[PDB]
């Protein structure tokens, strides 16, 4: 199957709700020489986000069951079988992110997008780890976000959905992983105020996507400030 054939099967698997195969279709495309297009890396992002989304949901259910005999152990190994699948998915996406995606990225917008994913799946890892793995995941997550944030501030307008979506996930990292509501609100409020000032820079094609993420920023700001 050719390069465009794998991209079509990813769009096929997307609507078929078979997201595990959507990864293999996109994993065999991003590793090619070409750089992923605007829609291509969207399928790559959509694919993995659903693959790890199911285990994140599955892990969050099994944790609350234990947080509420041989049943004590049966849940502990089941909850760890999901954590192994959560690591396999994160290590798989982070490996191609660090071997091909980020190195071969030349566009400033491409670098922000991939460095954001690096922060995202490092953050998924730190959601459940404890000890050395949680401390290692927290550091790499913040290092990739800060790198994306520095490149986004100089190469992207403040209303760009990739720049706004980054600060949204970066702010969630501060509140949920680093437990710093003051650092989350500060970055989230600044990201909202930076985009409000340059409203003329809101592009026609990127208009609806930018307004949506700004509302997601304010919803988090309201929740964190209680």
């Amino acid at each position: 199957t050719s390069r465009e054939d794998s991209v079509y099967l990813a769009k096929l698997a997307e609507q078929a709700e078979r997201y595990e195969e959507m990864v293999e279709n996109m994993k065999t495309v991003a590793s090619s020489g070409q750089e992923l297009s605007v829609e291509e890396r969207n399928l790559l992002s959509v694919a993995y986000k659903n693959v790890i989304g199911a285990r994140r949901a599955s892990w969050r259910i099994v944790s609350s069951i234990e947080q509420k005999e041989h049943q004590v152990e049966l849940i502990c190994s089941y909850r760890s079988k999901i954590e192994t699948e959560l690591t396999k998915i994160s290590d798989d996406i982070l490996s191609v992110l660090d071997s091909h995606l980020i190195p071969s990225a030349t566009t400033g917008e491409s670098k922000v997008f991939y460095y954001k994913m690096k922060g995202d799946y490092h953050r998924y890892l730190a959601e459940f780890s404890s000890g050395d793995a949680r401390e290692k995941a927290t550091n790499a997550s913040l290092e990739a976000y800060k790198t994306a944030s520095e490149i986004a501030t100089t190469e992207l307008p403040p209303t760009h959905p990739i720049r706004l979506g980054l600060a949204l996930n970066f702010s969630v990292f501060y509140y949920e992983i680093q437990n710093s509501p003051d650092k989350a609100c500060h970055l989230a409020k600044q990201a909202f105020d930076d985009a409000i000032a340059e409203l003329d820079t809101l592009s026609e094609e990127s208009y609806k996507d930018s307004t949506l993420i700004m509302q997601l920023l304010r919803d988090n700001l309201t929740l964190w400030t209680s």
Binding site: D120, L168, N169, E176, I213
Partner: peptide, 8 residues
């Protein structure tokens, strides 16, 4: 619980 970027 905070809300992260969903599908675009």
């Amino acid at each position: 619980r905070s809300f992260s970027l969903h599908r675009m």
